[PDB]
Design a protein around this ligand. Structure first.
Ligand SMILES: CSc1ccccc1CC(=O)N1C[C@H]2C[C@]1(CC(N)=O)C2
Ligand SMILES: [Zn+2]
Length: 139
């Protein structure tokens, strides 16, 4: 679990969005596993606007942060799950690191701010949904 709180927006994994997220929907994209909802309180986070390919992410299943080198956002095949059919997930970045079911929502940050959130994993890999291209989050 986990979310990004920026301005009057809450960014979550689309498959973990609550009834309240859907009732306050701003934008969602099944191909990216992202959903953004509106909030009444001002958020605590800031978004990176950069091309960093190194950063640190929070891994809930280890209660620890790990440094990672990750690929640029791209279209990557993801096997079927209870949440989605087998498909290509867009704007996804991969890295070598631990991730298991429950780790989705962990934040990846670089020196500039929040880069994205955990969305995939397994076999010593961790995948992050990028948010750096969503410029409207800043206004
Ligand atoms: C950290 S998630 C994970 C890790 C190891 C093993 C299995 C998982 C679950 C997993 O792949 N999931 C759950 C939900 C998000 C999704 C992938 C996707 N973005 O389409 C569907
Ligand atoms: Zn950066």
């Amino acid at each position: 679990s986990g979310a990004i709180y920026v301005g009057n927006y809450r960014v979550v994994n689309r498959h973990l969005a609550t009834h309240n997220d859907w009732a306050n929907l701003v934008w969602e994209d099944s191909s990216r596993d992202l959903l953004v909802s509106s909030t009444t309180a001002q958020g605590c986070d800031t978004i990176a606007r950069c091309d960093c390919q190194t950063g640190v992410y929070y891994c809930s299943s280890r209660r620890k942060h790990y440094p990672v080198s990750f690929s640029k956002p791209s279209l990557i095949f993801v096997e079927a799950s209870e949440y989605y059919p087998a498909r290509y997930q867009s704007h996804l970045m991969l890295a070598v690191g631990h991730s298991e079911p429950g780790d989705c929502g962990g934040i990846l940050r670089c020196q500039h701010g929040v880069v994205g959130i955990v969305s995939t994993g397994g076999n010593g890999l961790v995948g992050f949904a990028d948010v750096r291209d969503l410029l409207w989050l800043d206004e």
